[PDB]
Symmetry: none
Subunit: 69 residues, 2 copies
């Protein structure tokens, strides 16, 4: 694998933690390890089905009379 | 903003190409720049519904119609 190894920069030189398979003058890239995570954003609370929603229940009396003559 | 440092590992030491003024035993991770390995071709094509999965021959009983009097 393309392995990472840790090293301790002593006095101006990087001294490994465990040996490296490299030769003299081998070129590599190194960085000071970081911490913390980035920022996170979440979708705000919405109206859920469990919330009180009114229904449209109509009611008529169904009139069925007739004026006579 | 962290940079990536480059160093040359000579005789078991990592010697940067850009001098750093940090502590003795400062913590860093090393990366060895790697080449990518390509892929080959996967599996052949499958059989779909419109591809006709098997034979499509069935017996027609032909026309017998109706007879009356």
């Amino acid at each position: 694998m393309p392995k990472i190894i840790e090293a301790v920069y002593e006095n101006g030189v990087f001294k490994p933690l465990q040996k490296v398979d490299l030769k003299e003058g081998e070129r590599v890239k190194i960085k000071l390890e970081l911490k913390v995570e980035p920022i996170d954003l979440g979708e705000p609370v919405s109206v859920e089905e469990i919330k009180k929603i009114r229904d449209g229940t109509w009611m008529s009396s169904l009139e069925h009379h007739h004026h006579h003559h």
